[PDB]
Write a protein that binds this ligand. Structure first.
Ligand SMILES: Nc1ncnc2ccccc12
Length: 167
């Protein structure tokens, strides 16, 4: 048994809810929250900007030190950093950004990072301002992630379309 409430059961391991991820993280304090990161860990907008603002910019300060030491992530890659006031850990995962021309086949590689964690609170990778089709992102998630994932979708209209269209 875990602390997540009102998530709609999709599969054996994937759950979905129309919710503000900042607000969900603040309430649950999950072991892992996933950030929709870019390779530079520059959290200006989307899930990344929303999460970083909720940490009072401590996520960005930590991220800048990580990049200064290690250099940029790979598209499809990840790193584990602090969850600050939101979670124990933040898994920063880089899905491909269609609005930068990145290979959408890297979306499966991105979701494979989730399998290193038994339970996660996450957004749909490559959805929203990343330019991918969120229906596609949900299909890759279900077909890739084997660990228990609680998906928070910010937009109500998109949530309803994702549930209604789910195969
Ligand atoms: N949860 C969010 N709060 C504010 N802005 C956002 C932008 C994209 C996704 C989620 C959020």
């Amino acid at each position: 048994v875990n602390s997540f409430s009102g998530y709609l059961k999709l599969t054996d391991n994937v759950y979905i809810k129309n919710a503000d991820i900042v607000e969900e993280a603040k309430k649950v304090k999950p072991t892992v929250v996933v950030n929709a990161a870019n390779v530079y860990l520059k959290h200006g907008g989307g899930v990344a900007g929303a999460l970083n603002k909720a940490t009072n910019n401590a996520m960005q300060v930590e991220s800048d030190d990580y990049i200064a030491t290690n250099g940029p992530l790979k598209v499809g890659g990840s790193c584990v950093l602090s969850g600050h006031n939101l979670a124990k850990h933040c898994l920063h995962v880089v899905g491909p950004n269609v609005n930068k021309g990145e290979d959408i086949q890297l979306l499966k590689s991105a979701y494979e990072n989730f399998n290193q964690h038994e339970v996660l609170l996450a957004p749909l990778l490559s959805a929203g301002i990343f330019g991918a089709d969120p229906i596609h992102s949900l299909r890759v998630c279900v077909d890739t992630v084997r660990t228990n994932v609680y998906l928070a979708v910010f937009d109500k209209n998109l949530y309803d379309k994702l549930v209604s269209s789910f195969l």
